[PDB]
Amino acid sequence: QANNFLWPFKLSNPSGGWGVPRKFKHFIQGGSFGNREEFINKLVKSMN
Amino acid sequence: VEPVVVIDGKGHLVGRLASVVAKQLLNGQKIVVVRAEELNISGEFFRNKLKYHDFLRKATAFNKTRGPFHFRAPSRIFYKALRGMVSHKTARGKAALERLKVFEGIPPPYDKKKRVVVPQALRVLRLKPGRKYTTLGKLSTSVGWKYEDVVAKLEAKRKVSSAEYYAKKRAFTKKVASANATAAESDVAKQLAALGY
């Protein structure tokens, strides 16, 4: 109920950048996609 | 930072020098390269001699007299290496090249005037120790240019006329070094030193 009440967030592109040269690889091998576990906080705060 | 910036090819690298001289023009920075002949490239001689002749066989078909005019004179050899990075067509260019002046040797009215060097384009600061590297001079000679001699001689003369100068000067600043050395220590001095001078 609380999640569905919240509208899907509209984030800007990250303030610093994505870090990586190429975005579309897994995070485990120098990309952006997939699970990043804890570093998502660093990413979303720049995207905020 | 100086209306004109006379440069001295002597011990440089066609490409790098050029390039940097290029930018300097497109940004309104008059220039004047000298000693052109005593310029430098990279790689054995037999090299640049080829990577050129090829540029020689060029020429247009029907009318060889209307094609790639192969300039021998170094100054030019280099001037090309440059006009190659400068739209040299759109007025913005023409406006440049119009800001250049590559001489072979060092003729007046510059002889008498300071020069400099583009530390980011020195054989001795880019080429790994002991490693083949042309010297335009020969290169030009080998392919036409009929004066390497004149400049040559007609050069040494310039170095003289000067060398002699320096002396007079050096012999002059030998005094100053003393004038102050003595007039040094006093007061008025001390103070300065404190502030830094």
Binding site: Q29, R36 | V116, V117, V118, P119, V124, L125
Partner: protein
């Protein structure tokens, strides 16, 4: 840049199988998540498991003991290639375990074109007593009172125009 991680796993305990064998190994990685990912890849090579069947029990950093003492690291490495995989031993004179494995990865890329995915680090061990140094280029620095110059110094000019004609003495 790298960090060293101590990872342990035990293929989730089932009925009549209480507390399994706990496979311990030291992993070099840039961060915690990559260390976990590499750990599963090594478990599947040594034996028959999967990521879903097991659990990461504890993942802890291992700081280097004395990062002010110059050591001699003798590293064993297994790595994939264009041909079949093959074992290797190299020697690195360095400060820490982490800096040693770092310079190894750069050297492996330089001389063999092997990326991080291709390389398994078998075992990193110090060489305490000299004369166990099998390589020449490491033994090279172990002579008494090594005094050498660094001639022909490339001095970086921030400005584009110099007025002195740079004389590269040292």
């Amino acid at each position: 840049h790298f960090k060293e991680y101590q990872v342990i796993g035990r293929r989730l305990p089932t009925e009549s199988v209480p507390e399994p064998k706990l496979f311990r190994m030291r992993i070099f990685a840039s961060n915690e998540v990559i260390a976990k990912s590499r750990y599963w890849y090594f478990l599947q090579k040594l034996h028959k498991v999967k990521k879903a069947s097991g659990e990461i029990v504890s993942i802890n950093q291992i700081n280097e003991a004395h990062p002010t003492k110059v050591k001699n690291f003798g590293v064993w490495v297994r790595y994939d290639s264009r041909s079949g995989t093959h074992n290797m031993y190299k020697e690195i004179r360095d400060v820490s375990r982490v800096a040693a494995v770092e310079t190894l990865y750069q050297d492996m890329a330089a001389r063999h074109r092997a990326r991080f995915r291709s390389i398994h680090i078998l075992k990193v061990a110090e060489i305490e007593k000299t004369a166990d140094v099998k390589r020449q280029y490491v033994k090279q620095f172990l002579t008494k009172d090594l005094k050498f110059p660094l001639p022909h110094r490339v001095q970086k000019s921030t400005k584009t125009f110099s007025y002195k004609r740079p004389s590269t003495f040292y």
